[model samples]
Target: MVLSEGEWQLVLHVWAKVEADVAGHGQDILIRLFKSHPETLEKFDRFKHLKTEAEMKASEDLKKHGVTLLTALGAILKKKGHHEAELKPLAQSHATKHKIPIKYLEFISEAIIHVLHSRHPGNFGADAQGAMNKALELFRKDIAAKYKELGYQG
Candidate 1:
């Protein structure tokens, strides 16, 4: 997705707020993802033992996934197209070893947008939404190319 200069400007304008929200509230966002899509939980070996929602919430390890993901997102937002050297391998691993479907990435996007809107209700409007959606689309396109090479459609 080719975002306009204005879209990029809107994204940068809110990146700091988004990053802070992610760093402080990412666990809640992840919980929302798991809650909305229970199937994603089974894909993570580390989360296999978290058989219950309460257990999942209390697991310190669960928060690590939140932290790692949001941290990477922050990096990507800071240096768009510059972190592929780091992202390509991670996306490839998800596609090949974990066999994570592409839908799960969409789920992550929904969760992120949910968190952003929930936290900054008035600020996360169309411009922010468009920017974020475009950003994720770009990231997903890169990951999907690897998945295609591996003969996986999802």
Candidate 2:
């Protein structure tokens, strides 16, 4: 999927708006993901016992993780077509080491879109919305395939 210049700008604009509240927003995204899919927390041994946002905030490791995820997302979203290079290694580790499934990855990507939409209601016009959706769809499929190519059964 290709992003026109306008869509690209809009994507960046929404990212900036979201990053403006990075900590709080990232925490919310994680909380929502855990709440929706408790199984996901198993991958994070550090966050397994922690349930509340306050509890999450108390852990430096959690904070660092949040930063890593959000920062990676920021970088990932910026690269429209060439995401596979970055995503391949990410898929390998998440699949092989963490045992996260393609389904979970899809869920997380959806959660990202939900968070972006929630942060700025009605901000994503047709152009931007389509771009984000297409980009993520491509990202998910590519990563899932990459996991398989890396000898991950799941």
Candidate 3:
């Protein structure tokens, strides 16, 4: 699905706020993901051992990976029509190496929207939320397609 020009603008507006504290917000996104779907943590060898919220919060690895996650999002957002190229490698790694289920993409998307709303309730209004939701939906679909192409069941 294509985002309209107005929707893209809305997404970029909130994205700027997210970028302001990428690491912090990214950490929160993962935390939200883990909380909502505990099984997702098992996919992360580096983070699987972190059982407690406090432990996850204090984890340097978590912080670093969080930044990586946001950086990928930034890359995807900055370039239009290159979503597949941007996400293919990530999907391949997760599907082949990490053995992550494709469903986790949806989980992380939800976590991102949740964190954005909580962090910037005023700025992330309905329009922004809808736009972001669409953007992430596109992201998830592209990644899932790559996963399918690699013959990864999940």
Worst 10 residues of 2 by lDDT: 1-10
Indicate which candidate wins on TM-score.
3
Regions of model 3 farther than 4 Å from truth: none
Please give, for residues 1-154, the per-residue lDDT of candidate 1 as tens digits.
Answer: 5667777666667767766656457787888888999888888889876777789778888888788888877777666655667676777778778888889999988988888878876667987887888988888887788688767757
TM-score of each: 0.87, 0.84, 0.94
Better of 1 and 3 by lDDT: 3
lDDT, candidate 2, equals: 0.76
lDDT order, best first, reads 3, 1, 2
How high is the lDDT of residue 42 in model 2? 85
- lDDT-best of 2 and 3: 3
Ranking by TM-score: 3, 1, 2
Alpha carbon lDDT of each predicted model: 0.78, 0.76, 0.87
**lDDT score for residue 2 of model 1:** 67
Candidate 1 whole-model C-alpha lDDT, 0 to 1: 0.78
Candidate 2 residue-wise lDDT, 1-154, digit = tens: 5657776677787788888777777777787787777788888987899877678667777767877888887888788666767786688788788888888877777777777777777776666666677777776777767877888847
